[PDB]
Amino acid sequence: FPFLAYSGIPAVSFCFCEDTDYPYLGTTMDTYKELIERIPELNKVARAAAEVAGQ
Amino acid sequence: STNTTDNIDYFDISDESNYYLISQLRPHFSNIYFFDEFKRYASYHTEIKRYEDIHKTKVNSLLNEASRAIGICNRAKNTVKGLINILENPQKFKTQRESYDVKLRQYEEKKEAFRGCLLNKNRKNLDQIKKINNEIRDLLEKLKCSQDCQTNVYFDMIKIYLVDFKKMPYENYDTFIKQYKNSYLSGVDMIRKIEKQIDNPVTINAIKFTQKEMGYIIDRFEYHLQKVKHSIDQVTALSDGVKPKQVTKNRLKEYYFNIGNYYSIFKFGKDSLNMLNKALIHKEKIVHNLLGELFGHLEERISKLIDSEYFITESNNIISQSEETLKLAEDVYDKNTKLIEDLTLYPHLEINEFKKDYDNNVEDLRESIIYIQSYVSSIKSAYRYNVLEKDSVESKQKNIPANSNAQKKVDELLSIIDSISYSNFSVAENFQKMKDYYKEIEKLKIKILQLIEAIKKYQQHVEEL
Amino acid sequence: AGSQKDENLALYVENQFREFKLSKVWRDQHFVKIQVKDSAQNSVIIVDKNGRLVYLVENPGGYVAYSKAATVTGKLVHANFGTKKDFEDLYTPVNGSIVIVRAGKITFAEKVANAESLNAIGVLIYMDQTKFPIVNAELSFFGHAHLGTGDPYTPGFPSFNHTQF
Ligand SMILES: *[C@@H]1O[C@H](CO)[C@@H](O[C@@H]2O[C@H](CO)[C@@H](O)[C@H](O)[C@H]2NC(C)=O)[C@H](O)[C@H]1NC(C)=O
Numbered sequence A: 001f002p003f004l005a006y007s008g009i010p011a012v013s014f015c016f017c018e019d020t021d022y023p024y025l026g027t028t029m030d031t032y033k034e035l036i037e038r039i040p041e042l043n044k045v046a047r048a049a050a051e052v053a054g055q
Numbered sequence B: 001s002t003n004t005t006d007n008i009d010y011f012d013i014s015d016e017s018n019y020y021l022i023s024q025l026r027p028h029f030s031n032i033y034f035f036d037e038f039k040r041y042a043s044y045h046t047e048i049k050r051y052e053d054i055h056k057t058k059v060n061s062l063l064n065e066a067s068r069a070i071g072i073c074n075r076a077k078n079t080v081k082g083l084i085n086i087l088e089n090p091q092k093f094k095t096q097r098e099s100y101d102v103k104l105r106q107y108e109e110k111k112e113a114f115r116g117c118l119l120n121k122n123r124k125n126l127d128q129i130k131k132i133n134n135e136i137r138d139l140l141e142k143l144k145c146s147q148d149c150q151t152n153v154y155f156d157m158i159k160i161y162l163v164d165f166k167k168m169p170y171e172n173y174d175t176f177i178k179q180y181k182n183s184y185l186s187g188v189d190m191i192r193k194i195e196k197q198i199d200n201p202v203t204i205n206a207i208k209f210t211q212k213e214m215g216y217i218i219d220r221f222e223y224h225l226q227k228v229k230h231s232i233d234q235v236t237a238l239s240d241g242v243k244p245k246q247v248t249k250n251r252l253k254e255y256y257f258n259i260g261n262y263y264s265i266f267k268f269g270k271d272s273l274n275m276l277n278k279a280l281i282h283k284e285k286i287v288h289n290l291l292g293e294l295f296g297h298l299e300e301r302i303s304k305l306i307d308s309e310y311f312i313t314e315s316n317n318i319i320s321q322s323e324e325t326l327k328l329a330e331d332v333y334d335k336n337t338k339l340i341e342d343l344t345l346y347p348h349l350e351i352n353e354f355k356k357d358y359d360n361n362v363e364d365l366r367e368s369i370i371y372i373q374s375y376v377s378s379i380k381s382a383y384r385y386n387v388l389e390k391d392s393v394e395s396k397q398k399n400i401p402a403n404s405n406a407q408k409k410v411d412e413l414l415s416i417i418d419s420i421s422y423s424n425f426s427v428a429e430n431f432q433k434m435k436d437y438y439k440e441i442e443k444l445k446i447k448i449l450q451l452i453e454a455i456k457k458y459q460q461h462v463e464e465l
Numbered sequence C: 001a002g003s004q005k006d007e008n009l010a011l012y013v014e015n016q017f018r019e020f021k022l023s024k025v026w027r028d029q030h031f032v033k034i035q036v037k038d039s040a041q042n043s044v045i046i047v048d049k050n051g052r053l054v055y056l057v058e059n060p061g062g063y064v065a066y067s068k069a070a071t072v073t074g075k076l077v078h079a080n081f082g083t084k085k086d087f088e089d090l091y092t093p094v095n096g097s098i099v100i101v102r103a104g105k106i107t108f109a110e111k112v113a114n115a116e117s118l119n120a121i122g123v124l125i126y127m128d129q130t131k132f133p134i135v136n137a138e139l140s141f142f143g144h145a146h147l148g149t150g151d152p153y154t155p156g157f158p159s160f161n162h163t164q165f
């Protein structure tokens, strides 16, 4: 939003999001253990998002 | 298994200009294979079959020189081998008095010396090679046909080389070095963490040394693998193509040297990949045999650390102490409740201002005790979330060692100790807030004491009225 | 922001970009003004009408960035999301009072800006079970409340040493 709204550069942002909000986002709990407990396979998902940003 | 390695044959050297690659296995250069394929080339015609006689003798002489030079590098190779066997086995290192960094230092020195003996004696071998393939250049300048001769031997040798390329298994080597590389880089990272974790550095020194040697083996295996794949791909690139029937002498010479160089690279390559495969699997077995000695000590650190982190005995001190204060508060409170219930009915509205003082302090009493109850409820709530963290770690810790696969077990123990390292960040805040509520309990204990003393002097007052 | 660990990860990433052999790797630095905690704990308390005795709720680990350093007493009104639509359908007047909202649907700064526009005096923000199902009810979180972006003490011009601050 500062890039697009301020400087006038076309900007993009994308997430593999879930229907409900991610519960502990700016909290003290957010760590790799609760992450990999939440998303059971992480390497394929981040593999896909890195593939999109490569494209 | 065995703590030491049998074959020391993976060490190698090439010339400084990168023009010639040597090896430890027979016949230590690829261009000898090029001279054997050139020898069946020389058996194909007559003008060059006089030369298959001649360089039969010559290449045999060069083979004797290379074998003798490798013999001198055998009597150096034992001097390297002893320094390997000191470093790989921990108790064999524990017998001597010499420290680790000095023995690794002399190991580097003797490795450079061994590599030096193969280098220099093979330099004299390379002077012999330049004489030989110079006379090979004289052969394909010696041929009687200037542009008469055909391309039939070339395409036939495309066919023979193509079937031999169809013979060899490439994909299992490829997937093999991918799997072994992935396990290797994972091993380097987990040894890097576990170095800072564990206490005893002897085993971790031997492991780290074997990691270095394994990395050297992996790089050699990649070099021979990529060279084999490039050779087969270039031969299929020749196997595409537009076919000529008539050739001049100079270009046919370049074609023959090209394809002969290619299959020579191949037949050297599969042998090098074979030996590197075998010794590589042996070193993998050694690193298994060391990590198996490590994980029992690692489990002792985990069991020590779980009691340390989650702040448990201090917490139970806070909870039992706070419930003790609640018990004393209800005890002295009820002990005065009978006299208070007499004191409220006693005055008969005789006094007003001090009655206002009384029901001030009474409401302060009741609301204070209920506030103590809500405080204790909060403390026990934060504590049960903290214990829920701990029992999540223990419930993982039960199902970790049931797997038993001798290399991932260290990784799961490192994963769980990494999980307590994650959990500290939030557990600290829980314990902090429990300390704050206990400070509140102390202040309310002071208030309930002075209020009860006030009520005692108050009943003395209304008894005076 | 600006802690020592951030500089360790910083020199780690710059060390990586140097190691990947990019065509040019370069570093820039600024000097900004942020909002951090102090020694005195910020807290929230039920005050009785009598004022005789004091009840603690918690000493929360979280803090909101760019809040005003103050202390307020007053009544508390639930203000579901603080959206303008959610303020227009509100039963009670909002002036001279503290609002409590639950986290979601908009940034913190638009909640504080809207409740400031209807002349409230303070904002408490939580997260609850229906939107955020978490096992423990004890963890605390972080947010900034600056409407708009940027270093707020240099609007429009950059925060270098050249601009004299
Ligand atoms: C650039 O501006 C910064 C302002 O952040 C100056 O750094 C501060 O200077 C004051 C006065 O000497 C001291 O508090 C510290 O030396 C600096 N503060 C911090 C937090 O680092 C700085 O001197 C200016 N000039 C240069 C050349 O950097």
Ligand SMILES: *[C@@H]1O[C@H](CO)[C@@H](O)[C@H](O)[C@H]1NC(C)=O
Pocket (backbone or CB within 6 Å): C095, C096, C119
């Ligand atoms: C809000 O403050 C007081 C208290 O409710 C009230 O009298 C006043 O009219 C309200 N509005 C403004 C703009 O002050």
Ligand SMILES: [Ca+2]
Pocket (backbone or CB within 6 Å): C150, C151, C154, C155, C156, C157, C158, C159
């Ligand atoms: Ca700015």
